[PDB]
Design an enzyme around this catalytic site. Sequence first.
Site, PDB file in Angstrom:
ATOM      1  N   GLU A 165       0.770  -1.241   0.000  1.00  0.00           N
ATOM      2  CA  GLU A 165       0.000   0.000   0.000  1.00  0.00           C
ATOM      3  C   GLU A 165       0.812   1.309   0.000  1.00  0.00           C
ATOM      4  OE1 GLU A 165      -4.138  -1.596   2.023  1.00  0.00           O
ATOM      5  OE2 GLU A 165      -2.934   0.044   2.921  1.00  0.00           O
ATOM      6  N   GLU A 352      -5.646  -8.609   0.354  1.00  0.00           N
ATOM      7  CA  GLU A 352      -6.319  -8.109   1.548  1.00  0.00           C
ATOM      8  C   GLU A 352      -7.778  -7.807   1.282  1.00  0.00           C
ATOM      9  OE1 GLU A 352      -4.979  -4.994   4.212  1.00  0.00           O
ATOM     10  OE2 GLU A 352      -2.872  -5.472   3.822  1.00  0.00           O
TER      11      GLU A 352
END
Length: 448
Positions: A165, A352
């Site tokens: 991320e 995720e």
Amino acid sequence: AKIIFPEDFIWGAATSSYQIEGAFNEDGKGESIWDRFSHTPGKIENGDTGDIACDHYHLYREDIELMKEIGIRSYRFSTSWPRILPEGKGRVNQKGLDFYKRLVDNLLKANIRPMITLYHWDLPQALQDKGGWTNRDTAKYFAEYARLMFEEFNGLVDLWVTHNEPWVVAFEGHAFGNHAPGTKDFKTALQVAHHLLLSHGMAVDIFREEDLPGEIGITLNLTPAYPAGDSEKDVKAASLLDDYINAWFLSPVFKGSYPEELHHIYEQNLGAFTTQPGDMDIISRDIDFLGINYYSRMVVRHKPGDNLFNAEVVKMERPSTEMGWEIYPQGLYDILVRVNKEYTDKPLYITENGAAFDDKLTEEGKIHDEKRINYLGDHFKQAYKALKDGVPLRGYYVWSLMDNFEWAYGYSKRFGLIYVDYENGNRRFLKDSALWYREVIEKGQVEA
Ligand code: NI
């Protein structure tokens, strides 16, 4: 029935080093910016820290067994750079490596497949004491630390992820300054963003060079954006937002350029961030898979506007998670088939997905987390659909294996398949969702 997945679909669960391990200063591990940020008043909800977390560093054996019990076939975890190289560079702290060698070893002997995430946010505080990510050097040291780990787990570790991320790391940590290292300067966020991307490529270069058996990739957070009103002033205003999170990392990775419209408005208003000829070539080295983190979609409405898009995000009221994240499962379909259409043919992994609900631990250690069960199923079925059309989806990692430290929110939000009773034995309870999931993996099928 129907909705049956490939038999060797990689079902898994994910965690992160800082969020679960604990032992923050134990055994020669160095200080990270998250240790810092944590011990800074006013940064974390209820003044929580990752100081102990789930004590994973100590209970990892119990945790593998709990994994075994849920029957997951892969485990996505983060490897703590400061625990392995306390200064970020220089001397290798052996006891820290041994830990992960032990973890991997239990993972393998239990027939669970390790996927290692190289940088999950916990930059060594000593590197932050030079520029942190605004220093080009950091990218170089990341690569070296990446090299170290390739060499070590050569025959053992199969799937590698350079970054988790980058977008948030950059903007959450150096723009709005509510992640480590806590800074608030949009200019420096743009530079950080560029150096993360850079170090990524450098790492994948070292990967190929070292010639380890597995496949390497990167984990971006994608959040589709859509116009609130029919306005053209909205569409334009959402395309921006979207490019600001998504294209802004997707493009450099897969296309070898930043997205020009945004690239230009940035440089217009703020300066240029310092590039360096041939950087965009490193950034876009060929990779073997992309890893995607999805939680929600965003609705964007044009409305001037403290920012320069000049957009705002509309709070909906759809049902939502404890984070306030609008539950909207089809958005996950859209985004998967989109990455496939516009960016890459390479295999895809949901690295995720999950949600936090207000879990209640029953007196007999039971946790009937229905809402979570439904949320997972819903997104599980959407992935099946993406699979059912073009997309080369290879796996799905549920966030998270266990409740843990939700960054600024601390332990107030539980994302686990396993409920963690910190205040007691730090002991672990399988939620209903965990057990339900064991079935989805075994029978190979969800169910509507
Ligand atoms: Ni998270």
